[PDB]
Amino acid sequence: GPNICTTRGVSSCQQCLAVSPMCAWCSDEALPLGSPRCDLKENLLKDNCAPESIEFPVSEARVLEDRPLSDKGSGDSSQVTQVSPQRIALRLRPDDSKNFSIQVRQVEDYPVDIYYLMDLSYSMKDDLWSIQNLGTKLATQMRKLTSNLRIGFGAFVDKPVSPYMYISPPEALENPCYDMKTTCLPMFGYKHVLTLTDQVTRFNEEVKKQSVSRNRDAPEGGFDAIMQATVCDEKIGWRNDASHLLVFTTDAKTHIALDGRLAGIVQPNDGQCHVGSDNHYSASTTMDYPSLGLMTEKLSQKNINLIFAVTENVVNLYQNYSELIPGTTVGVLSMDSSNVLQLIVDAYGKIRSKVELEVRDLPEELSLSFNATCLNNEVIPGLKSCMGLKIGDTVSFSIEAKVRGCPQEKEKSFTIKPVGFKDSLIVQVTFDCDCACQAQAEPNSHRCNNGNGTFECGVCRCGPGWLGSQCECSEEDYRPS
């Protein structure tokens, strides 16, 4: 006495199997008369139906291929595998489904971008060697901690206007060291030198190929350079996924907002990318310095970490400045750069990932229910995310499938992909709603009652006036015998 396999007036194998997985059709003609051919599965196997006369199809998922999730960071045969299993097959009984688990483990090293800002004021002539050594060792160090490192650099002196500039002698515009009868490069506001690139040797050569300039006042215009390196995306070449670091080098005080009024610059800093096609800050002489608030706002907006690499005599000063720019560290710039390299090492150690699944090629005929077992074995049904993933951390997701009835196509597929990760899990989907017994169909041929029907699964689909088990009776005929 099945709840729905007989109460629904079940009389055909196709609809008997399509109504619900719990319903199955006993096909053999040898079945003695009794309970319908679609009795409850639990008792239908014994309700006069032989074991070989009935099939109990059940949905299942098969993991054809799988791989250990690249525990260590060494090279692999083809490449590291982040998500397992790799592919699974899923034969789904109409309106049937079950659970399958997918585990993710970050193995790939993080992408990092570093932009090095070099103070080319004349006061730095003795500190130029330290700047170059630090610039080289930044790459030499980070390359040994990751592999997606991109590096670049620019420079700054001060706003090219009076009273900062050396304009007095007509021939000092090309050599502010005219007074000392030496040669120094013409002064500039801010110039972007090398874009973020993986060619470490080119960056080293360009950094070591630098020279100092000279202005008048001790405070420099480093904040303009910081703002321009922050707000200019295409020019600097910031990546949307890498961790952004902005190292800043100096050895003296810094100009702040409203310092430009002395030079006739009263327009507040716009906070927009103003580097033209010549890689120079074209609004240096008409826009004031940026306030600390704007600098912090723009740094946060673009997830740029700011590190001060300053000399001893000013460290305290900039240390205090860090308190007003949360998320920034300070390190002494000297011949021994280990102190300032520890800051970058710690910053890299602070990196964390994100995990989010995807559903790409699923049709509307199928759906998934997600249950995330995140770090610490914390189970939380109803999400597809996980935070705070280091290298080698593991999370998992148990997914319960669901299919509406019997889809219109026999074969399909869908790929589940973690966000950002190139790897994915491909799922092949098939459906077996059709009756295997119906392969022995016989329309209007022998059997039944002189034809007048279609023998499919022990019952003949008789025509009008022939309704019956084998068309031996009519729709409205009764036997008084």
Binding site: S162, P163, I167, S168, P169, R216, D217, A218, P219, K253, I256, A257, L258, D259, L262, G264, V266, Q267, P268, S291, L292, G293, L294, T296, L317, N320, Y321, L324, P326
Partner: protein
């Protein structure tokens, strides 16, 4: 401050017109002008491009702006084809200060060819114009060349005029940008002027000196002000040093006689630029100058705990002992740079305390600039701004910077109130705001009979002989005001006789004449001590309202007729800010409990029904006979509320008996309830008890309901207005009066029957004898119904081995099912004194019947048809004998639809008799 029609001035596009503003009040003449700086205007000087200008503007006389012929000379030549000075792109007009006839302008970006070597150096310069003489002034153009000396002094970046004709000037760039202050006597400045001399030296010059290298890049002289801070009667110098002390910022106060440091103020946040603008002014009328210091870029903890940039202003009140009392004001927007410009205004409102304007030039909507006005009070500044002016020009290619420069404390229009001028050099504009006369209005309203009595109906209602109660309302208006104001002001007064009473529910008072709860009148008032007054007589409605506890509120509001109160130029006056535009007062009315105006009730309820039992059917309406009483000081608008069961419906009060009160009542279904609401007096007389006579339908239409009413008495009293909840529960009685009766036809018979012959095997009705039919009726003639009952009926079958009444059949009406215990129609026959015969002595037949539902008054019937066995009477045993055949019927109820209710087993019985006699008796 007038804000709807200020005076707007514009300069040549891109000229920064409005960078620095000031007033010009010539001593010789009477007219006043506005001075506006245009540090980028293009001048007619030979070979000079964007030299800067100072423009004098006429104000009311068509608002024309014309340049001042300060200097018509291009660069001077230190030698043939060897220029001495570089006027082009000098910011002339970047700072303008006027004192009587002395106009002082300065170019901070003026470089000169150093006399010792061909070289540019921004020593800055200034021009001082007296009545007719004009001279050039430049302390920093000295022989102290280079940045290490006064080469980059940029003198004139900030300037001020001392009270005793000493000009103070600030060079932020002197001594490697340490800064410097130069103070010189104007008389010596004009006297020592010599065009052929470029390094003029003044004997009475007060100047600061160079300090250690630790003070480099401090920018002393970024802003300057003057005020006395040592009590010597000579104004001392105040300067802001925005970059001192590791960029914390500082403010220095130097003695105004020998230039010795007096006080140092220090900031607390790095890079806040503490000292961008400073201002000395007494803000509490204590005669001691107070210091206001601006930090436009101060960052403070936000709502989320993160630092946000809002700016700040530090206000340091001076004290006699030499200490200072410091408070702080924070900006109201992010990146608005609040505190950029601080402008003393003087007594903007003549309240007796000086007021100050603080500008946030990048605040407001679209970052068009904003200015806040803070009014001074004793014990410090009113930290809450009183007015906010907003820029009205959108940025063309640069932020308008409205409010970036300000100047006040001069009464340009001569109305007794100082005016303000604000600069919008971003759009190259300057706007003059005129202060409005501040009228302080004292309005006094008083109702002499604060507590009014209806019984005081001594007032004759106009138009009819009827009487009302008249009470007085008095309203007085006195409008004082300083400065030039019209001698007469046309005030408008409006009076509402009953405030509150929301949605215009009801107003219980009306003016004696022209009855209406509102009245307005225009009353002239002259500024003075004449407390002009007026009176009105208002009367309350006896029983036109149903709320006599909430006090009647009288409300008065006055509007000054601004339209006619303006001057000849169209400047309308204003009313003081703190005076309330309305005055409201409370009247009262009392009933009973005179000494206890706060009247306190003590309610009580009781209930006892007379017919506390119901028959679950058609019956008299249920009456509760409720008792309501009170023992408190009263019970206002007393009402009885009764919640009835769904089976009960409201019925009108009982009029049969006069003891019950003649109480009107109504019904409602508020909140899905069933409420009967009646009145109990407004108010109850000394809480006297009352007797209710209300009825209810008590229509019981659900057999599953078990046996109750609830009730309470409430009042409009302000306290203890809810009586104890009192409930009653009536009971249900199953009055299912079931009766069984019957009838027989024919009632008598005569034997032998005419045309009848004896038959041994009768087959039809005629062969046997006459037909006898008995009808039995079971009726539930009661208000209560039963669902199933048992019915009985016994019949006489055979007497003396002979049949008495041969039953032919039994018919069922339908409300019951019957079964016979003995064979019916066994032979299948085609369909003197009288003695009683029946089941007692004769073989008897009984039929058992089960009866189904029988509602209130419903009935069912059972029929029996039989044949009289004639041969039984023709036998010798019964010949010439008359008999009375008897049958009996009985009933017994077993099941009632009121399953929850108790069920009683009720039974009874009756009898039906037929008579048979021998008609043909023997002859006598």
């Amino acid at each position: 401050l007038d804000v709807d029609s200020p005076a707007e001035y514009s300069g040549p596009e891109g000229s920064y017109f409005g960078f620095a503003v000031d007033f010009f009040v010539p001593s010789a003449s009477s007219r006043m002008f506005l001075l506006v700086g245009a540090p980028k205007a293009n001048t007619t000087q030979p070979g000079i491009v964007e030299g800067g200008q100072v423009l004098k503007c006429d104000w009311s006389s068509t608002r024309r702006c014309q340049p001042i012929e300060f200097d018509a000379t291009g660069n001077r030549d230190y030698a043939k084809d060897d220029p001495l000075e570089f006027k082009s792109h000098q910011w002339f007009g970047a700072s303008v200060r006027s004192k009587q006839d002395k106009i002082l302008a300065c170019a901070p970006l003026y470089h000169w060819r150093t006399e010792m070597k061909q070289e540019r150096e921004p020593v800055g310069t200034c021009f001082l114009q007296d009545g007719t003489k004009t001279v050039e002034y430049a302390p920093c153009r000295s022989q102290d060349i280079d940045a290490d000396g006064q080469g980059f002094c940029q003198g004139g970046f900030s300037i001020d005029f001392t009270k005793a004709d000493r000009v103070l000037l600030g060079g932020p760039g002197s001594f490697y940008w340490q800064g410097q202050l130069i103070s010189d006597q104007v008389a010596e400045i004009v006297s020592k002027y010599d065009p052929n001399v470029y390094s003029i030296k003044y004997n009475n010059q007060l100047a600061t000196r160079t300090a250690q290298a630790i003070f480099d890049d401090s920018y002393l002289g970024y802003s300057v002000a003057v005020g006395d801070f040592n009590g010597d009667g000579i104004d001392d110098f105040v300067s802001g040093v925005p970059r001192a002390a590791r960029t914390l910022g500082m403010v220095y106060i130097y003695d105004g006689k020998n230039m010795s440091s007096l006080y140092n103020f220090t900031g607390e946040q790095m890079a806040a630029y503490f000292g961008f603008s400073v201002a000395a002014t007494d803000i509490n009328g204590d005669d001691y100058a107070d210091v206001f210091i601006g930090a436009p870029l101060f960052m403070d903890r936000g709502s989320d705990g993160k630092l946000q940039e809002v700016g700040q202003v530090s206000v340091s009140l001076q004290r006699a002992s030499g200490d200072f009392q410091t408070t702080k004001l924070n900006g109201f927007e992010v990146f608005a740079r609040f505190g950029s410009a601080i402008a003393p205004l003087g007594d903007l409102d003549q309240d007796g305390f000086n007021d100050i304007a603080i500008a946030a030039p990048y605040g407001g909507e679209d970052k068009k600039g904003i200015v806040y006005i803070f009014n001074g009070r004793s014990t410090g500044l009113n930290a809450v701004p009183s007015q906010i002016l907003e820029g009205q020009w959108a940025a063309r290619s640069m932020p308008p910077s409205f409010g970036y420069s300000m100047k006040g404390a001069t009464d340009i229009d001569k109305n007794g109130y100082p005016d303000l001028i604000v600069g919008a050099f971003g759009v190259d504009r300057a706007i003059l705001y005129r202060a409005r006369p501040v009228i302080t209005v004292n309005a006094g309203l008083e109702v002499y009979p604060s507590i009014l009595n209806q019984d005081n109906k001594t007032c004759s209602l106009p138009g009819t002989a009827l009487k009302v109660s008249c009470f007085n309302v008095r309203f007085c208006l006195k409008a004082d005001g300083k400065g030039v104001l019209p001698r007469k002001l046309n005030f408008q007064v409006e009076l509402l006789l009953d405030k509150l009473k929301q949605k215009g529910a009801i107003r219980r008072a009306l003016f004696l004449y022209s009855r209406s709860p509102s009245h307005s009148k225009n009353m002239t008032i002259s500024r003075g001590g004449l407390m002009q007054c007026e009176e009105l007589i208002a009367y309350l409605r006896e029983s036109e309202f149903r709320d006599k506890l909430t006090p009647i509120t009288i409300f008065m509001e006055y509007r000054l007729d601004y339209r006619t109160a303006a001057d000849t130029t169209g400047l309308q006056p204003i009313l003081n800010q703190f005076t309330p535009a309305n005055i409201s007062r409370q009247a009262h009315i009392l009933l009973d409990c005179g000494e206890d105006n706060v009247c306190k009730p003590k309610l009580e309820v009781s209930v006892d029904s007379d017919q506390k039992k119901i028959y679950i059917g058609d019956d008299n309406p249920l009456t509760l006979i409720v008792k309501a009483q009170n023992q408190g000081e009263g019970a206002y608008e007393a009402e009885l509320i009764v919640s009835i069961p769904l089976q009960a419906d409201f019925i009108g009060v009982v009029r049969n008996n006069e003891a019950l009160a003649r109480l009107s009542c109504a019904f409602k279904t508020e909140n899905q309830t069933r409420q009967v609401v009646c009145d109990l007096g407004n108010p109850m007389k000394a809480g006297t008890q009352l007797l209710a006579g209300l009825r209810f339908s008590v229509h019981q239409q659900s057999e599953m309901d078990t046996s109750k009413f609830d009730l309470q008495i409430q009042s409009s009293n302000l306290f203890d207005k809810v009586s104890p909840v009192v409930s009653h529960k009536v009971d249900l009685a199953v009055l299912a009066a079931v009766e069984i009766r019957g009838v027989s036809s024919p009632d008598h018979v005569f034997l032998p029957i005419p045309n009848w012959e004896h038959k041994e095997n009768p087959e039809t009705e005629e062969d046997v004898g006459p037909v006898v039919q008995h009808i039995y009726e079971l009726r539930n003639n009661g208000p209560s119904s039963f669902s199933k009952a048992m019915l009985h009926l016994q019949w006489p079958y055979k007497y003396n081995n002979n049949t008495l009444l041969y039953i032919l059949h039994y018919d069922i009406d339908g409300p019951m099912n019957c079964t016979s215990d003995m064979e019916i129609n066994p032979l299948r026959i085609k369909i003197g004194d009288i003695h009683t015969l029946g089941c007692g002595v004769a073989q008897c037949l009984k039929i058992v019947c089960q009866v189904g539902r029988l509602d209130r008054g419903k009935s069912a019937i059972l029929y029996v048809k039989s044949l009289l066995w004639t041969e039984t009477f023709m036998n010798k045993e019964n010949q010439n004998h008359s008999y009375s055949l008897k049958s009996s019927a009985s009933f017994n109820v077993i099941e009632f639809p009121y399953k929850n209710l108790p069920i009683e087993d009720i039974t009874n019985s009756t009898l039906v008799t037929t008579n048979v006699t021998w008609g043909i008796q023997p002859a006598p």
